[PDB]
């Protein structure tokens, strides 16, 4: 768990997975990929947010990798760096 937290209620993988209960199954990215990469569903469209950095992303397409998208849009996220390392984030 990172020092910095934007949504303490979503600190656990289990809480983040729980938000995907009503995730549209037509979206081509799996809930476990998103939750593992720090993301939870905010309940509208395919909108998600990271529990650590509060970074928000939508319009998930086939082939999107949540870790790669996390590092390109929110490269200074503390959770991202603790999980994947400085070396993974361009």
């Amino acid at each position: 768990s990172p020092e910095f937290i934007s949504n303490l209620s979503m600190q656990t993988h289990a809480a983040r997975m729980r938000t995907f209960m009503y995730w549209p199954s037509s979206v081509p990215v799996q809930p476990e990929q998103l939750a593992s990469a720090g993301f939870y569903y905010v309940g509208r469209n395919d909108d998600v947010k990271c529990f650590c950095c509060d970074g928000g992303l939508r319009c998930w397409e086939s082939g999107d990798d949540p870790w790669v998208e996390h590092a390109k849009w929110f490269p200074r996220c503390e959770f991202l760096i603790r999980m994947k390392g400085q070396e993974f984030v361009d």
Binding site: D47, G55, G56, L57, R58, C59, W60, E61, D64, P66, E69, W73
Partner: peptide
């Protein structure tokens, strides 16, 4: 994916 894009930012909101």
């Amino acid at each position: 994916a894009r930012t909101k």
